[PDB]
Write an enzyme that holds these catalytic residues in place. Structure first.
Site, mmCIF file in Angstrom:
data_model
loop_
_atom_site.group_PDB
_atom_site.id
_atom_site.type_symbol
_atom_site.label_atom_id
_atom_site.label_comp_id
_atom_site.label_asym_id
_atom_site.label_seq_id
_atom_site.Cartn_x
_atom_site.Cartn_y
_atom_site.Cartn_z
ATOM 1 N N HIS A 76 52.483 58.468 49.892
ATOM 2 C CA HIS A 76 51.883 59.078 48.702
ATOM 3 C C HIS A 76 52.786 60.119 48.048
ATOM 4 O O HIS A 76 52.494 60.571 46.933
ATOM 5 C CB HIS A 76 50.542 59.762 49.040
ATOM 6 C CG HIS A 76 49.467 58.810 49.453
ATOM 7 N ND1 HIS A 76 49.079 57.741 48.673
ATOM 8 C CD2 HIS A 76 48.710 58.750 50.578
ATOM 9 C CE1 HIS A 76 48.123 57.067 49.293
ATOM 10 N NE2 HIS A 76 47.889 57.655 50.455
ATOM 11 N N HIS A 121 45.711 52.364 51.777
ATOM 12 C CA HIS A 121 45.819 53.079 50.509
ATOM 13 C C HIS A 121 47.067 52.652 49.758
ATOM 14 O O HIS A 121 48.074 52.268 50.355
ATOM 15 C CB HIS A 121 45.869 54.596 50.721
ATOM 16 C CG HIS A 121 44.700 55.134 51.492
ATOM 17 N ND1 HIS A 121 44.748 55.361 52.852
ATOM 18 C CD2 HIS A 121 43.449 55.475 51.095
ATOM 19 C CE1 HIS A 121 43.579 55.822 53.260
ATOM 20 N NE2 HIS A 121 42.771 55.897 52.216
HETATM 21 C C1 LIG Z 1 38.155 66.348 52.881
HETATM 22 C C2 LIG Z 1 38.744 65.308 53.769
HETATM 23 C C3 LIG Z 1 39.785 65.909 54.685
HETATM 24 C C4 LIG Z 1 37.659 64.384 54.436
HETATM 25 C C5 LIG Z 1 38.262 63.550 55.543
HETATM 26 C C6 LIG Z 1 39.456 62.691 54.997
HETATM 27 C C7 LIG Z 1 40.070 63.091 53.591
HETATM 28 C C8 LIG Z 1 40.203 61.924 52.663
HETATM 29 N N1 LIG Z 1 40.433 62.260 51.243
HETATM 30 C C9 LIG Z 1 41.619 61.600 50.582
HETATM 31 C C10 LIG Z 1 42.718 60.862 51.438
HETATM 32 C C11 LIG Z 1 42.459 59.758 52.290
HETATM 33 C C12 LIG Z 1 43.435 59.096 53.028
HETATM 34 C C13 LIG Z 1 44.795 59.462 52.958
HETATM 35 C C14 LIG Z 1 45.835 58.769 53.721
HETATM 36 O O1 LIG Z 1 47.016 59.135 53.639
HETATM 37 N N2 LIG Z 1 45.555 57.684 54.571
HETATM 38 O O2 LIG Z 1 46.606 57.114 55.221
HETATM 39 C C15 LIG Z 1 45.069 60.541 52.105
HETATM 40 C C16 LIG Z 1 44.078 61.207 51.378
HETATM 41 C C17 LIG Z 1 39.118 64.065 52.914
HETATM 42 C C18 LIG Z 1 37.676 63.517 53.161
HETATM 43 K K LIG Z 2 49.240 49.854 50.886
HETATM 44 ZN ZN LIG Z 3 46.331 55.402 54.177
#
Ligand SMILES: CC1(C)[C@@H]2CC[C@@H](CNCc3ccc(C(=O)NO)cc3)[C@H]1C2
Ligand SMILES: [K+]
Ligand SMILES: [Zn+2]
Ligand SMILES: [Cl-]
Ligand SMILES: [K+]
Length: 353
Positions: free
Chosen positions: A133, A173
Site C-alpha cells: 500500500h 487488498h
Molecule cells: C481500526 C482497525 C485497526 C480495525 C482492525 C483492522 C483495520 C482495518 N482497516 C483498514 C486496513 C485493512 C487491511 C490492511 C492490510 O494491509 N491488509 O494486508 C490495511 C488497512 C482497522 C479496523
Molecule cells: K492484491
Molecule cells: Zn491485505
C-alpha cells in the site's frame, strides 16, 4: 536447485504502543518462522541474511521527503508518533518502525540478489511491516515503503533497466502503491487479485477496478482482478490463474517473478473474509514456478490469522522446495469479474483472444 529463506527477529520490534492487539502483530513473522521449523522446511532452505535497505535504495521508488519523514520517526516521543501516524490512512508508528521497514526491504533485496546471481533458484521472505500500500510519497495501510516495488527496481539496478519483472499480488487488498509506482511501466507487469466490492473494501478506490489497465507505455501492463459479492476461495482463485494470470504472464515472459504474498485471503482471516486454503496457495505457487525459469521470490504482505498465515506460507515454501502439490463451480459474480478483466485486456494480450 536451492530455496533461499530470509527471516530476522528484529522486524518484530515494530509495534503498536496504543493497541497491543492491532492485527499487524510482531508474532505474525515469528509464528510463520516457527511453523517452518515444525514442518522441517527451515533446514531444507539456504538462510539469506537480512540487511538494511539504504536511503538511496528507497529512493528507487520513494520521494526524499517521504523517506526523511519516516526516518524522523525513530527519535519521536509518543504523541508525535501518534500525530505522524494519523497523517496517513491506517498507520501506526513506533521508534523501531523505520528500521524494521528498512530490514524488510533489504531482506528482499538480498533475496533477489541471491536469485539473480544464481546462489538460489527461488526464495521466501518472512518480513514485516508490509509494503504494497505504500506510495511514492506516503505511507498507507500498515505499509511504510513498497518492499516489492523496490525489489523490482533493485533487480533492474543489478541487471538492466528493462528486466521484465512480474509482480503477482494475491493479498486480498489492492496494492495501490505498486499499481501507481509502475502504472506507466512496461518493464514491470503488475497483476493484483483483490476484494473490491465496488469500492467498499479497503483501500476504497476505483483505481482497483478492472478497467485500470495501465497508462501510456504501460497500457496493458496493469491487470486488476476485482472480486464483488462476498466470499471467494480456491475455485475462484484457480480460475483467475487459469484464465488470466497464467496466460498473460506466459505472454509477458518475465525474467523474475515477485509475489506480493499477503495471506489475508486465507480461510480464517478476520480482515479478508475469504476462504483460500493452504493447499490453494500451494497450487498458486506451483503455477508461478513455471515462469521465469523458476526465479520466484515470495514476499509476505498482509495476513492476520496467525495459524492461517503460518500454514499457508509454509505450504508455499514447500512448493518452492519442489514438493508435490497437494490434492468447484464458481460464484457467479466471480465469472462476471473474470470476464470483465478478459474484455479489458484482450486488446493487449493475444493469449486472451
Ligand atoms: C481500526 C482497525 C485497526 C480495525 C482492525 C483492522 C483495520 C482495518 N482497516 C483498514 C486496513 C485493512 C487491511 C490492511 C492490510 O494491509 N491488509 O494486508 C490495511 C488497512 C482497522 C479496523
Ligand atoms: K492484491
Ligand atoms: Zn491485505
Ligand atoms: Cl499519545
Ligand atoms: K505496469
Amino acid at each position: 536447485p536451492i530455496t533461499g529463506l530470509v527471516y530476522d527477529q528484529r522486524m518484530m520490534l515494530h509495534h503498536n504502543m496504543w493497541d497491543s492487539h492491532h492485527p499487524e502483530l510482531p508474532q505474525r513473522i515469528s509464528r510463520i518462522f516457527s511453523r517452518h521449523e515444525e514442518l522441517r522446511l527451515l533446514s531444507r532452505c539456504h538462510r539469506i541474511p537480512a540487511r538494511l535497505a539504504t536511503e538511496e535504495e528507497l529512493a528507487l521508488c520513494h520521494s526524499s521527503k517521504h523517506i526523511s519523514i519516516i526516518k524522523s520517526s525513530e527519535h519521536m516521543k509518543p504523541r508525535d508518533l501518534n500525530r505522524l501516524g494519523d497523517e496517513y490512512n491506517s498507520i501506526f508508528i513506533s521508534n523501531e518502525s523505520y528500521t524494521c521497514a528498512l530490514l524488510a526491504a533489504g531482506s528482499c533485496f538480498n533475496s533477489a540478489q541471491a536469485i539473480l546471481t544464481g546462489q538460489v533458484r527461488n526464495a521466501v521472505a518472512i518480513v514485516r511491516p508490509p509494503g504494497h500500500h505504500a506510495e511514492k510519497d506516503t505511507a498507507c495501510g500498515f505499509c511504510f515503503f513498497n518492499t516489492a516495488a523496490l525489489t523490482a527496481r533493485y533487480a533492474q539496478s543489478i541487471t538492466r533497466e528493462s528486466l521484465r519483472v512480474l509482480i503477482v499480488d494475491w493479498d486480498v487488498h489492492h496494492g495501490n502503491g505498486t499499481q501507481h509506482i509502475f502504472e506507466e511501466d512496461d518493464s514491470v507487469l503488475y497483476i493484483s487479485l483483490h476484494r473490491y466490492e465496488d469500492g467498499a473494501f479497503f483501500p476504497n478506490s476505483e483505481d482497483a477496478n478492472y478497467d485500470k489497465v495501465g497508462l501510456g507505455k504501460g497500457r496493458g501492463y496493469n491487470v486488476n482482478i476485482p472480486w464483488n459479492g462476498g466470499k471467494m476461495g480456491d475455485p475462484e482463485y484457480m480460475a483467475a490463474f487459469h484464465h488470466l494470470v497464467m496466460p498473460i504472464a506466459r505472454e509477458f515472459a518475465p525474467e523474475l517473478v515477485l509475489v506480493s504474498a499477503g495471506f489475508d485471503a486465507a480461510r480464517g482471516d478476520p480482515l479478508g473474509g475469504f476462504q483460500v486454503t493452504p493447499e490453494g496457495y500451494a497450487h498458486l505457487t506451483h503455477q508461478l514456478m513455471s515462469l521465469a525459469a523458476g526465479r520466484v521470490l515470495i514476499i509476505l504482505e498482509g495476513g492476520y490469522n496467525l495459524t492461517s498465515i503460518s500454514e499457508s506460507m509454509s505450504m508455499c515454501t514447500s512448493m518452492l522446495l519442489g514438493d508435490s502439490p497437494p490434492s468447484t463451480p464458481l460464484k457467479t459474480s466471480a465469472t462476471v469479474s473474470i470476464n470483465n478483466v478478459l474484455r479489458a485486456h484482450a486488446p493487449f494480450w493475444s493469449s486472451l483472444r
